Every structure is written in C-alpha cells, then in structure tokens.
Amino acid sequence: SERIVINVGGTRHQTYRSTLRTLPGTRLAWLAEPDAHSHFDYDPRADEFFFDRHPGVFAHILNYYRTGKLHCPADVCGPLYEEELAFWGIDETDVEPCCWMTYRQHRDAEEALVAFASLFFILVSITTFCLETHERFNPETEAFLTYIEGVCVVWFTFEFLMRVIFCIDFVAILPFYLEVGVVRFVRILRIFKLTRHFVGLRVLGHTLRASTNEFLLLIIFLALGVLIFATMIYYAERIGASASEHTHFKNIPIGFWWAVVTMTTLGYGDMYPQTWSGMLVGALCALAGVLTIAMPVPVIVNNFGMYYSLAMAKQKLP
Amino acid sequence: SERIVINVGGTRHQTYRSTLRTLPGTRLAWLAEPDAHSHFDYDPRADEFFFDRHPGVFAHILNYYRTGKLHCPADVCGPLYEEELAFWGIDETDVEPCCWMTYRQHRDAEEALVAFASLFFILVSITTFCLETHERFNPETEAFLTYIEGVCVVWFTFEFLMRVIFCIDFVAILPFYLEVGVVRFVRILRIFKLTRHFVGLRVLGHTLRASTNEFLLLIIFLALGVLIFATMIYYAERIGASASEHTHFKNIPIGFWWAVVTMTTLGYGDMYPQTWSGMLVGALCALAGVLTIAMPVPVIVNNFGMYYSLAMAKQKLP
Amino acid sequence: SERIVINVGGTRHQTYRSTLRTLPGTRLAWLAEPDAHSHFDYDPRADEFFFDRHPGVFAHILNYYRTGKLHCPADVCGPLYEEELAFWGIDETDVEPCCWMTYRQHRDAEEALVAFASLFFILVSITTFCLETHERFNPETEAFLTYIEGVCVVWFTFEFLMRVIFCIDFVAILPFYLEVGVVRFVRILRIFKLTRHFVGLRVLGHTLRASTNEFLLLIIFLALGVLIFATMIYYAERIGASASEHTHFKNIPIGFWWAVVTMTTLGYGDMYPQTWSGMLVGALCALAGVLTIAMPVPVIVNNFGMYYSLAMAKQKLP
Amino acid sequence: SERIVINVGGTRHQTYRSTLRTLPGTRLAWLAEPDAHSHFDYDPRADEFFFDRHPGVFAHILNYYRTGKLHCPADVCGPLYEEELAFWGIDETDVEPCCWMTYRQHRDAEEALVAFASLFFILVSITTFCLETHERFNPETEAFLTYIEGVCVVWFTFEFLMRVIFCIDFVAILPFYLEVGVVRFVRILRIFKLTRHFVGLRVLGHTLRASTNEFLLLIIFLALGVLIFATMIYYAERIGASASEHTHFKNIPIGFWWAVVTMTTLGYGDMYPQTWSGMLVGALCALAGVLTIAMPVPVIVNNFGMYYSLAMAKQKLP
Ligand SMILES: [K+]
Ligand SMILES: [K+]
Ligand SMILES: [K+]
Ligand SMILES: [K+]
C-alpha cells in the first residue's frame, strides 16, 4: 500500500508499489524492492527516483502497469515511442490492435526500403525492334534495319565484356547471346537497366513487394465477380430467346471478357446486353466492379504515398 | 467557494466543490460532501485525494464538470478514453457529436468483426458447368462432360454424408439433391465454401454488413439521377425532329440504359446523343454521375480500410 | 521585469507582466495592473491567481501573448478551443491560416446544416408518364393510361386542397393545375416531395450548397480544357489531309463533344482520332481530363463525408 | 553528474549538464558552465533558470539533447515548432525523416504560393475563331465574320497601345500584330488574360509548378506500360493466326494507341483484342493502367487540396 514517486525529467509521477510489481521483468519492477536505493538515482530527502527522459510519454508507459494494456500516443511518432519502450524494458509486441498499425508504419516503411553511351543504343535497339513489325519496312525485310541491329550488338559487347569474367544481367542481357545463336520480346527489358537509377521506379518496386497480399485480394475479388456476372448475363440474355442468334453471349466463357471490360468501366462496346434482363444485370455489374476494384486499391496506393514521401524526404536532406 | 485538490497520478488538479456537484451521480461528485475523508485515499497533511490513474486524460474529464460538455482527446485512442470514462462514472453517450465518431470507430469496427480433396472437384465441377454452354461440345450434347458430372457428384456425397446426420449447407449444397431430380446456376456458389478461410473475403462480408445504409444511399442517388437524365435526354433529342426516326432515344424507358452507362463513365457507345441539345444533356449526365457515385463510395471504402487493417494486424500478433 | 503566476486548474504558469500587456483588451491584460488583487481570485500566500479552466489549452493561449501569434492545438477539437478563447477574451479571427480551417471545420459543418397514400400515386403517375412515350401504347394514344391519369389527378386534390386555404408546393404542384388547363416534365419532380424525409438527400442538398465555389472551379476547368483540346485536335487532324473527308473533326465546335467525352474517360467511340498527331493530342486529352476533374472533386467529396458523418452521429444519439 | 533545472514557462524540467553539452553550439549549452548565472534569469533561491516560452514543446526540444534525435510534435503545427527551434538555437534540418514532411508542409505551401470592355471582345474573337471552321459559313469564306474580326482588332489596340510605350503581353498579344501582316491558334489563349484574377486558376498554376516531379513520374510510368503492353498484345494476337489480316494489331506502333486508350479506362472500341490470348493481355492492361495512374495522381491531388485550402483561408480572413 506504500507509494513511490518517479521524477521523470522533472515531472513527478506517483503510484503504488503494487502497480509496479504487475510486470515483473521490466526496469520499473526493479524499484519496488526494499533495496532499489542502492541501484538507481535516489534523492533521499525528496524520497524519489530521478530518470532523465521524456516526461510526456511516460504516462503512457505507466498506464500499462496501471490498467492492463499498452497503447501508443498520437502526439509522438513511432520512432520516439519505440525508443522509450526500449529504454524501459517493455516488449513492443504488447501494443494493442488499436495502435499497432500507426505505431509501426514508419518502421514497416523503413525496412531498408558512359550512361549516355548506353542509353542511346538502348533506345536505338528499341526503335529498330518496333519498326521491323511495321509493314512499311517489309516489301520480306530490309537491310538498314539489320545494319542498325549489327551496330547495337557490336556495342552491347563493349559494355557486356565488362560483366562476367571482368567482374537483371543474366535474365535481361541474354538476347545479346541469342542474336547470332523471345528472340527479341526480351529486347525491350533493357529499358529497365537505365531507369533503375530513378528514385520513383525503385519506390514502385518496393511498393509492388510490400503489397503482395493486397494484390492477391484484388485478383480474387475480380475472379469471383467475373465468374458470377459472366454466368448471370448468360441466363439473363437467354430469356430474350435452336441457338443464340440474337445475343453476343453465346456461352459463359465469352462472358468473362464482357464482365472484365465492364467491371473496370472501360466499355469497348463490342459486347453489350440487348434485353432488359441483361441490361439490369449489366447495370449491376458496372457498380459491383467499381466497388470491388475500389476497395483494395486505396490500401495499395497508401503504401506508395508513404514510401514515396519517405524516399523523397531522404533525397532532399544532406 | 471552498477548493479541492485531486492528485491524479502525481498531477495536482484544483477545482471548487461547486464544480464537482454539477454531475451528481459520478465518482467525483462523492468527494464534495463532508465525509469523503473516510471514503477515499486522503492525504491529511497535503489535504488532497490520490487517484492512481492517467493524469493526462483527467483534464478532459474534469472539463465536463467545468464547462458543461464532454469531448474526446485526440492524443489518446478510443479504448483508453473509454476505459477511463468507465473508471470515473461517466455515461459514454454524453460525448458531443464533434468527437463521437472518432471516439467510437474502433469499437464500431471491433464487433467481433481434405480441403485439397474438396477444392479439386469444386474446380472440376465449375469448369464442366462452363463448358456445356460452349457450342464446341454441342454437335446435341456430349458424354464425357456427363461422366465428369457423375464423378463430381459421386464425390460430393463423401463430404456431404458427413454433415446432417453425422452432425451455407442447405442453401449451397442443394444441387447435390437437384441433379438427379437454378438447376446449376447454384452450382457456382460452392466456390464460396472453400474461400471462407480467406481473411480478405470475411472482411469484405463484414463491410457489406456494416454499410447497408451507404448502399441504400448510393442506389437511391443512382435511381434519381437515372430517371432525371433519362427524361431529360428524350425531350432534348426530340427538338432535332409521326415518329422519331433519327435518334436512339425513342422512349424514356430505353434511356435508363443510356443514363446508367453514362453516369458510370462506362460508355459502350450503342446509345449516344446526336443533336447539340442532346450533347449538352449528356455532358451534364457524365459529370453528374461522377459526383453522385463519388460521394458515398468513399464512405463505403473507409470501412474496408479500417476493418481490413484491423483483421490483418490481428493476424500478425501472437 | 516583475513576474506573475497564473494557477490554471492546478497547473502553474509563469510569465512577466510585460508579456501580459501585449494584448490590452483581454482578461489577462487586466491582471498586469497593481489593483487586480481585489478583482480576481488571488492567493496571498502563493502570490498567485486561480482560474478554474482546462490547464492544458491555456499554454496555447499564453503563447499568443508570448510570441505574437495564435494557433490551434491539434489534441483538442474545435468547439473546446472555441469555448476557451471565448472565456479568455480572444477574438477568434486572429487564428493563423495554418490552423484556421481545422479550427472551424465543425462549426462550418454545423450551421444548422397518409405518406403511403401519397407515395403510391406518385409512383403511379411517374410510370404512366414514362409509358405514354413507349411506342407500344401508341398504335395514336391509348385510354387506360388516360384513366390512370384521371385517378391520380383526382387524388392529388385530397393532398393539395390541404395546403393553400387550409394552410415545393407551388413550384412542384403546378402540374395539378396544368393537367386540365413541361405539362409533365415537372410531373417527375414530385418524387422529391416524398424523399425530403431522407437523411441522405438532405445532406446532399447541404453539400451542394456549401460547395458552390468548388463547382464553379470544376466547370471553369472543364470549359478551358474542352476549348483548348477541341481546337488542338482540329489542327492535329488537319495535317493528315477543299474539305476534310477523312476525319470526324470537321470543325472546332464538333470537337467540344469529343473533348468532353474523352476528358471524363467515358469514350463512346463515335469520334476518335485517326492520324498519329491526333492520337498524340488525344493521349494528352485523356490524362489532362483525368487530372482536371480529379483536383476539385475531392474537395467536394470531403464536404459530404463531413456532413454525412455529423448527420448520422446525430441520428444515433438520443 | 550535477543536475540543473530549467523553469520553462512555469514547468520545471530537470536534466544533467552532461546532457546539455551534447550539442555545444546552442543556447542550452550556454548554461552548463559555471558562469551562466550572470547571463540569464537565475532564481538563486530555487537554483533555477527561467525562460518565458511554451512549456509544452520544450520536452521535444530537450529530447534532442537526451536521446540523440530531433522529432516534431503532432499536437502543434509546423510554424509554432519552427519558431521554438529558432528561439532555442536548433538547426531545423536535423528533423528526422519520420517528421520532416509533416513539419514542412505549411512552409512548402506558403512559398508566396474596363475589364468588361475587354472580356466582351475576347469572347467575340473566340467565337469568330470557332465559326470560320464550321462549314456553314463556307459556301469560300464570308464577310460579316471578317468585319467582326476587324472590329475586335481595332479595339485590341485601345488596350494594347496602353502597355508597351505607355508602360503574357508578348507571348499572348502577338496575334494583334499578325492579323493584318498559329495565326489564331494563339488567339484562344487570350482567355487566360481575363481569368488570371481567378483564385482557383492561380492555385492550379501553383500546383502545376510545385509538382513537376510527380508529373515526370506519371509520364514515365505510362510510357513504360504503353511500350510493354503494346509489345505483348502484338505477340498475343499473333498466335490466333502470309500476313496479319484478322486483328487490329498489325504492328507494334499501332498498339501504343490501344494501350493508352485502355490503361486510362477510356475504351473507344476502335481497337480491341479478338483472340483469347489477347483478351488475357487486355484484362491485364486495364488493371495495370488503373494502378499505374492511381499511384502518383493522389500525390498531385493532395498538393492542390493543401494550396487551395490555404488560398481560401487567406481570402476569408481580414
Ligand atoms: K472510365
Ligand atoms: K468506353
Ligand atoms: K470508359
Ligand atoms: K466505347
């Protein structure tokens, strides 16, 4: 029933010993015993214990011993609070689910998370790749395109004989091999090499890796919706009435196309309902797709907002 | 006019008895009278009352007795504050409407709110269900699909004779009864059986149940807009001039289709305005639909953000 | 240089008189002079002044006298701070622009801001209005529709001779007069009569009135974009080459339609670019419209979020 | 080992000198040595140092000396904390990246960031510019259009002989020069002359200049996606099978159009996939474009929200 005072950074908190012995493995629980005087900073005329720390966030630490639970203040950031919990001996996993997400956001985002003589020929190779398909240079190929191919491969050797014995490379600079030896479908990926110096694409790559669950969620939502609406639209268009000679929806498989074009509010118009039942089903499909897509995408977009703001805050400071 | 001190967790608050008497049914109101000395923790040389609670959130409780009204601090969470209101005797419905929603959101969101031998045949049944509609296996039916149905039903008994006398089951395993006797429109819903173990679909189901009013709102908005613009576009296209043989909008009913395809920014293109008045009306319809849809949808999406974040944080703590 | 202590709700603040005399018309400025001893609550053993108010929010009031400026705390709500500024004598217009909007949000949102025997015939009237346009009951008109018109007009008197001498009535029940004597374009609007009891449409009406500037903004943005892109697409499609017999864009006016259908991501497809220059212009138009629309619409949507949350928090407390 | 008390605005903080000498060039560091008594306000009966500043935000300043790092409180605004760091001698670039953006937002947004006798003829010129393109006034030109042109030019001098010798002027009023001597493609831009007094367009211009990086990001994302998906759709549509006479995608360049019309959810429908491989690729393209666009656009939209709210808070205070 005795009472003990903690003079934290000037601010005097009072409590009972009983409250301190509630979590026995921590630093505070080491003051409740009848010797703590010879183990701490003990003012023996004010009868108190001095600790040189933030007096503001201590009352949220003491609350753990007082009530039963550990929350996070909303007037300090994650790192400040975690530094204080680290000082006091509190396991940072007892944070209640109301406060865990905001408490961890910054750490979850931290997570460790001749160039012009290359870019020119990369762009050259991309363009020549694109124009061999155009039926302007296929009278049936032509030959200046093969010469420009020659030049880009003759340079790809100068910056690739610097790689393996002179030591994105084995999985993207294979066409250099296969040219004399997907043949060019891979050639575009070299654009990634020169743009890995961009602070925005690396933040993108980190976001597409910290959000693999919210991608599975979106894919499963879309698959469920597409199946449901594809099968509804078939039976809805069937009551308009052998065969189906009056409707774009001749089977359920061809309805997956319609459903995915509709749920995204794209709407080409090659497939659309033509009976009133179908029009009702399609009115439903449009809104259902809007909501289905709109639920997990904000979760994926906040991740980018956070990581981008952090990676650009770093790129502005010395 | 006498004054009283409350030493809450070290921090000394002062008031007059008069202020305390303002809410007479609470714990504080029991200190104003001349016997609390022998009913509480009373230091009779500092003349004060010790209470072993968070000293930070008390000044928002005392404010109730001081001014007239009860607000919620924005530096603590909902659960911490509600625990202390519970300690002090305050009815948590006196929270003013400025602070009520932010105070309750976490509690409103809490609300408690052989597998490989089954999934295989579920997928098998789904695909065979999709493929008898395709006019490739209808030279008019075929027979290997009928045997595939046979084997899936011969398995559906091994997981269904386990349920009702061996005791979504009656409303989704009826086709098992129905095949030998909607005939298979219901067959797809078995997909939900194996996917009720997904933490994302259960969060979805909880959000479509905590947001039944914001769905009514959206549907009513859309119906109002669709009717208004459908009747506007008819009269707008009529001044372009026995009949109207120059316009997609031959009646007002056929215009509900146009209006809903337009207000969603889908735009198939089977129906579009062709006179200048019609184009003005359609320009209005597009933006009106954008805003109409965009007002309640963010309310519905915040619910998912909250519930999903909570259910995923729970899946990460021990 | 003398110093004075203000004991607000237990918490002792210290300052110099010099700081107090900085705003001379307020309550604090009345303590600096050498007679306040007999005009307030003055402990003449602590040499201090007691005030029975929130001790936390006072340090943001004192800051005004200390530095020069008035800000709003982010750990209390608008109304609490407003009541304290009202108590201390501070003109609530001195709030710096960093804190003004967050300070006023709740007050800007407050701003004070037989049924089945009516709804039935309203719905009946709406339908019969919709189906005289359909060329199924126009072999030209028909007669059961005229009888249904008769019966709803015979009822509209029983709820309209209840209004003017027995005393949305004048500007919605003109068709009553106008039937026997726009004739029905207005007949639709009676739907609003029965839906004025809806908590969602009233919040809509309040939001469509508290955001009349953010509507002018959107309209002006769209007008500028439509004009610029309509004139750009004409000249862009003209280099594809006595007339223009190869392009949807024969003049600049007809391009306003294209531009508004494109900037909304609707895309019917009746007009699209067909030369490479046009495709570049259209690629620009799509994204420019996306961004133009997406800038003011979130401002308009937050207003609805706020007003709806308030109107539903009110409908949940007694 | 000695301890020192700082009495900031009433609130007494304690620390050791050891902590104070951690940052040796600041104001606090000037108290650690044994002469500061004669350089500050030193009560030699409580042995303490009085400073007349906000006692609340000091504990976040003192934390810098205590732990190692500088954070920003979330209960005060940017400018308040900035003024306090300025008072105490702290370099405001030591703010850790968790708190830097929230600290700077208001300053990043501050950054200093006859009318009817003109507007009439501006609108007149715009209209005239629009209708000589229309093939109703081209029997091929006409002459009342040239007379209206003449009148608006012979007014253009009364506001343009007032500007350069009586001294957006050279780069918008060159058409006046070139009329008698792009001839009018520039003629539309005069609309900006009269609308540069609009509070919304100036805020628009400020966000379009404070967000030039998030535009580069969007453009690069879109270019990457367009190239990748245009290459994929060609090869995907090729396996549907002496030429390509069955598909809209005859070469890779013409697929850039498809990809940009699809990634924006516009979907004209002049180009769409027709084989199942193509349909899979297009299903991917739609969602990929949605996400690609939706990542940086919210960053661009928050800037407008902030700058507009600030410019309207300024336009409402005296
Ligand atoms: K769209
Ligand atoms: K479309
Ligand atoms: K569309
Ligand atoms: K379309």
Numbering used by the authors:
A (entry chain D), B (entry chain C), C (entry chain B), D (entry chain A): 7 to 119, 192 to 217, 240 to 267, 281 to 294, 312 to 371, 377 to 453
Quote from the publication:
Voltage-gated potassium channels (Kv) form a family of transmembrane ion channels which are voltage-sensitive and selective for potassium ions. Kv3.1 channels conduct a delayed rectifying outward current and have a high activation threshold (≈ −20 mV) as well as rapid activation and deactivation kinetics. The Kv3.1 channels are, thereby responsible for neuronal repolarization, and high-frequency action potential firing. The Kv3 channels, like other Kv channels, are tetrameric structures of four pore-forming alpha subunits.
The cryo-EM structure of flWT-Kv3.1a was solved at 2.65 Å overall resolution. Another major dissimilarity is the zinc-binding site at the base of the T1 tetramerization, which is not observed in Kv1.2. Arginine R4, which is located above the residue Phe233 (equivalent to Phe256 in Kv3.1) in the structure of Kv1.2–Kv2.1, is in the case of Kv3.1 involved in a Π–cation interaction with Phe256. Overall the S4 sensor of Kv3.1, which is characterized by high activation potential, is shifted downward, in comparison to the structure of Kv1.2–Kv2.1. A total of four sites of potassium ions could be modeled coordinating the residues forming the selectivity filter. The analysis of the pore radius in this region shows that the lower gate of the channel is in an open conformation with a diameter of 3.3 Å, similar to other structures solved in the open state, such as Kv1.2 (4, 20–22) and Kv7.1 (25, 26) with similar pore radius at the most constricted region.
